[PDB]
Nucleic acid binder design. Structure first.
Ligand SMILES: [Mg+2]
Ligand SMILES: [Mg+2]
Ligand code: NA
Length: 348
DNA sequence: CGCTAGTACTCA
DNA sequence: GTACTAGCG
């Protein structure tokens, strides 16, 4: 998530209703809904007790979309990104800590406190996601498990013209170069839509409305793949990018002190970290639903060697990739949990 | 004014 | 994943 991006470009947003996309196809960042609905039954999840409330919670939204003549594509997070492993470890430690503390408060008598910790302990597994997948596919709703981050997969589906809008809460979708993003959507169909073309309505951006410059800005402000230099947020990064008559981003990164008059000295590690972050935003592996193969989010440019981009996700055989995409192969255990086949009983 | 980091929150 | 803001440059 880009910390503060939604508030920074709020002039590019407008209140809409999803009836706007009647007859069209939209993709869904389902893990948001999963995280929301899991909270309704955090006690049972923490205690290990069985619960299927989040399933109905998601299917509620799904049916809401279906009622307005919309075809929703539920997209799920797949395997872990090495380039994001920091935030993943952080959140893991967080959830585990709140879990142990929750158990402690459970055996201390503290009720609401332990329940709160349980809310802050929920780890969305592929099992729950697969419950939602079966529940959705039972009603003809297409589902897709990304090879890695759902963000990149959604971005691809939107760029490929397969879907016309992305339903999510994460601002990263804009940094991935999505055209239309529906945020803050409730269970009725009311949400805030940010359009890429409307980024020009943001006076603060300046000439930083192009996909490349916008990406550079989001990265420089601080993303999930790279922490920002101390003292650098959205405004100063956008300032740097505005005051630059140079397409070569690296030289600009080095001259950040000049462009800001802040006397900043950049570490040599941060340059490579930036290269890696940009390469992750650009070339993270996604799954083609049509050709059924692992491709990068954007086509490889001639100035990059795919061999060096393992942190943007490593390749597997397209059979495995397809079985993952269908939700048959467990993301964690890598063992088969289902045997669904889109041929026997999208992807056309 | 901008940015970091801590707090609080997503359900019902 | 989010929003809010007190402390501070
Ligand atoms: Mg995501
Ligand atoms: Mg993201
Ligand atoms: Na920052």
């Amino acid at each position: 998530g880009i910390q503060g991006l939604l508030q920074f470009i709020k002039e590019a947003s407008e209140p809409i209703h999803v009836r706007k996309y009647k007859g069209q196809v939209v993709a869904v960042d389902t893990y948001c809904w999963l995280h929301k609905g899991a909270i309704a039954c955090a006690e049972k999840l923490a205690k290990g007790e069985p619960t299927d409330r989040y399933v109905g919670f998601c299917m509620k939204f799904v049916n809401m979309l279906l009622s307005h003549g919309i075809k929703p594509i539920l997209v799920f997070d797949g395997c872990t990104l090495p380039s994001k492993k920091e935030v993943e470890r952080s959140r893991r430690e967080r959830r585990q800590a709140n879990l142990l503390k929750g158990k402690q408060l459970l055996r201390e008598g503290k009720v609401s406190e332990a329940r709160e910790c349980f809310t802050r302990s929920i780890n969305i597994t592929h099992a729950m996601a697969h419950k939602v997948i079966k529940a959705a596919r039972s009603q003809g709703v297409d589902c897709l498990v990304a090879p890695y981050e759902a963000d990149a997969q959604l971005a691809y589906l939107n760029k490929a013209g397969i879907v016309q809008a992305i339903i999510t809460e994460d601002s990263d979708l804009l940094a991935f170069g999505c055209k239309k993003v529906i945020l803050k959507m409730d269970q009725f169909g009311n949400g805030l839509e940010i359009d890429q073309a409307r980024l020009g309505m943001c006076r603060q951006l300046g000439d930083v409305f192009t996909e490349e410059k916008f990406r550079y800005m989001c990265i420089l402000s601080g993303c999930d793949y790279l922490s920002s230099l101390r003292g650098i947020g959205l405004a100063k990064a956008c300032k740097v990018l505005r005051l630059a008559n140079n397409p070569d981003i690296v030289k600009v990164i080095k001259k950040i002190g000049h462009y800001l008059k802040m006397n900043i000295t950049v570490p040599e590690d941060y340059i490579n970290g930036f290269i890696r972050a940009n390469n992750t935003f650009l070339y993270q592996l996604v799954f083609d639903p049509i050709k059924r193969k692992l491709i990068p989010l954007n086509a490889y440019e001639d100035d990059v060697d795919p061999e060096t981009l393992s942190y943007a996700g490593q390749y597997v055989d397209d059979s495995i990739a397809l079985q993952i995409a269908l939700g048959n192969k467990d993301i964690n255990t890598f063992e088969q949990i289902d045997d669904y086949n889109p041929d026997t009983a999208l992807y056309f």
